[PDB]
């Protein structure tokens, strides 16, 4: 299939394809770096700006996947363009702090702060030397510190809600996620994770508000599953606590009954496109079943 | 960049107490009595795409 | 309960955060209209 | 007790990591009730943050929908760490593991290393984790779980050095993706060819 991806193909459409890579953010560091040294033996005409982003989007994926000679190869390249650029720096104390001597991309960390005092970039990865050098509270007191500092990376705020994730802290979670939704609330997403978060919390008023949430994310987009399913669990909990009202209970109960009812239609005309699709729908059917009648 | 910091902090000051609060989460009950067929025209249009 | 039989449960055991504030300090009600 | 596990399970726990090698993997082992422990087959629960309960609440109510279906049971849980350098249970796994106890009488926690996880695998690379409700935490030395050690060496060189992992599905891309099944017909239909 190799030598078949190989022949219908043009570089314009692999150059098309990385960009829309980059767009995603995903992790395909096998295919990136596969795709990366192909266009840099085959075409090697033009495109010295893309061709850059290229080289160091190859690197990064090489650092990942198994290859440091190509990753110095990208490194020779692009010092030879630019003689003095922060950005080789940074990619070339990375690269050190891949392979040994932490402390050496350490100082030249600080060497890049002495001369830029605006350095998001050096800061962040040494946050994330410390994060896997020493424990994490120190990491997570360090990008507090740089988060009052600036107040202006969302990014900061999903890894710190992430660390915060595995020291079982919903509390601080809670706050994390309310202000990242704060900037986008379109993005159904973030307002997902919050209810998940939520719903971890516990508690009835906790689960009516993780349970409204849940309802609205599903009617911004329409697409998720997971949101259904909680709605719907959350449900069946709000139900089951004795310390509710009567109504309440039953407009919980119309609320679950109404998301199987959407479950068992969405397995259904989902059961046309193979023929294996009927042993899912019946597991799923039994399922809603034993639920039906284990709230009713 | 201008140097009116004070000025600036007081307008937003009360500014922000000027805001009230309106939860628009409240009205949920109008996603509830609805009908759910976008995601099937949705769901059709995803399956011919195959996998790379 | 038994009912769902399945049913994970996961507890919690300087003032850094920025906006988390260990109390709540409710009361505010403010009726402007100038 | 004895453990054993047929190479179909640990074949598709190893491509289960194989497949997200950067995040945290999550697995459940199936098993037969009608002394030795054998199992039957994986399914990948989870990838990535892998610290929520209510999807596992999905996952494992349709778990047992599935068991309840053809005639199965839940056997153990097994969990693999991120950073290569640890090698302990966390409180979620414990914690799966007392409810999985608390029905069956025999559930071990199979924990993933990371550090002897390359190409050509020697062969055991797997702890194996007796706990209970009680503090009885004891992680069996050496022994041997598999049939055919040689075979199963064979099988799992093949099915890496071939690049037709990409088709494991998990439960969440079945969320994502309702097209993609979750039970691996393809790798079944591999394992049976190989052998």
């Given at each position: 299939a190799k030598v078949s991806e190989l022949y219908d193909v043009t570089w314009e459409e692999m150059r098309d394809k990385m960009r829309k890579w980059?767009?995603?953010?995903?992790?395909?560091?096998?295919?990136?770096?596969?795709?990366?040294?192909?266009?840099?033996?085959?075409?090697?005409?033009?495109?010295?700006?893309?061709?850059?982003?290229?080289?160091?989007?190859?690197?990064?994926?090489?650092?990942?996947?198994?290859?440091?000679?190509?990753?110095?190869?990208?490194?020779?390249?692009?010092?030879?363009?630019?003689?003095?650029?922060?950005?080789?720096?940074?990619?070339?104390?990375?690269?050190?702090?891949?392979?040994?001597?932490?402390?050496?991309?350490?100082?030249?960390?600080?060497?890049?702060?002495?001369?830029?005092?605006?350095?998001?970039?050096?800061?962040?990865?040494?946050?994330?030397?410390?994060?896997?050098?020493?424990?994490?509270?120190?990491?997570?007191?360090?990008?507090?510190?740089?988060?009052?500092?600036?107040?202006?990376?969302?990014?900061?705020?999903?890894?710190?809600?992430?660390?915060?994730?595995?020291?079982?802290?919903?509390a601080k979670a809670a706050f994390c996620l309310e202000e990242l939704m704060m900037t986008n609330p379109h993005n159904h997403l973030y307002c997902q994770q919050y209810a998940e978060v939520k719903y971890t919390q516990g508690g009835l008023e906790n689960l009516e508000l993780s349970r409204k949430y849940f309802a609205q994310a599903l009617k911004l987009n329409n697409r998720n599953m997971r949101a259904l399913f909680g709605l719907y669990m959350s449900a069946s909990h709000i139900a089951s606590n004795p310390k509710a009202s009567a109504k309440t209970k039953k407009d919980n109960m119309k609320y679950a009954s109404w998301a199987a009812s959407q479950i068992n239609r969405a397995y259904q005309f989902a059961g046309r496109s193979k023929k294996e699709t009927k042993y899912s729908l019946k597991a799923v059917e039994d399922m809603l079943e034993t639920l039906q009648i284990t709230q009713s | 960049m201008p140097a009116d910091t004070n000025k600036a902090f007081k307008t937003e000051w009360e500014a922000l107490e000027l805001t009230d609060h309106q939860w628009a989460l409240d009205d949920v009950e109008e996603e509830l009595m609805a009908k759910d067929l976008h995601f099937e025209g949705m769901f059709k249009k995803e399956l011919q795409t195959s996998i790379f | 309960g038994r009912?769902?039989?399945?049913?994970?449960?996961?507890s919690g055991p300087s003032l850094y955060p920025v906006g988390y504030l260990d109390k709540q300090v409710p009361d505010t009600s403010v009726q402007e209209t100038d | 007790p004895g453990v054993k596990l047929t190479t179909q399970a640990y074949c598709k726990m190893v491509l289960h990591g194989a497949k997200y090698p950067h995040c945290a993997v999550n697995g459940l082992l199936v098993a037969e009730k009608q002394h030795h422990?054998?199992?039957?087959?994986?399914?990948?629960?989870?990838?990535?943050?892998?610290?929520?309960?209510?999807?596992?609440?999905?996952?494992?109510?349709?778990?047992?929908?599935w068991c309840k279906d053809h005639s199965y049971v839940i056997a153990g849980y097994y969990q693999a760490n991120e950073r290569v350098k640890d090698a302990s249970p966390n409180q979620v796994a414990e914690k799966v593991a007392s409810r999985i106890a608390e029905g069956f009488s025999d559930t071990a926690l199979i924990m993933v290393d990371n550090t002897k996880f390359t190409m050509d695998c020697v062969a055991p690379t797997i702890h194996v984790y007796e706990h209970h409700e009680n503090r009885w935490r004891c992680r069996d030395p050496h022994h041997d779980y598999c049939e055919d050690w040689p075979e199963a060496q064979r099988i799992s060189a093949s099915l890496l050095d071939s690049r037709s992992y990409e088709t494991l599905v998990d439960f969440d891309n079945h969320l994502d993706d309702i097209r993609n099944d979750w039970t691996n017909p393809e790798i079944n239909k591999a394992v049976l060819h190989l052998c």
């Open positions: 980059r767009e995603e953010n995903s992790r395909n560091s096998e295919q990136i770096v596969e795709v990366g040294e192909e266009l840099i033996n085959e075409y090697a005409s033009k495109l010295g700006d893309d061709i850059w982003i290229i080289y160091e989007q190859v690197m990064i994926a090489a650092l990942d996947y198994g290859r440091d000679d190509l990753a110095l190869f990208c490194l020779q390249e692009l010092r030879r363009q630019f003689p003095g650029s922060h950005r080789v720096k940074r990619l070339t104390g990375m690269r050190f702090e891949a392979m040994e001597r932490y402390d050496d991309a350490i100082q030249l960390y600080d060497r890049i702060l002495q001369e830029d005092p605006t350095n998001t970039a050096a800061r962040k990865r040494k946050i994330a030397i410390r994060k896997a050098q020493g424990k994490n509270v120190e990491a997570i007191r360090e990008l507090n510190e740089y988060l009052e500092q600036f107040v202006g990376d969302q990014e900061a705020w999903h890894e710190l809600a992430e660390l915060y994730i595995n020291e079982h802290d919903y | - | 009912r769902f039989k399945w049913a994970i449960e996961l | 422990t054998l199992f039957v087959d994986c399914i990948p629960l989870f990838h990535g943050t892998l610290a929520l309960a209510p999807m596992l609440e999905v996952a494992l109510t349709l778990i047992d929908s």
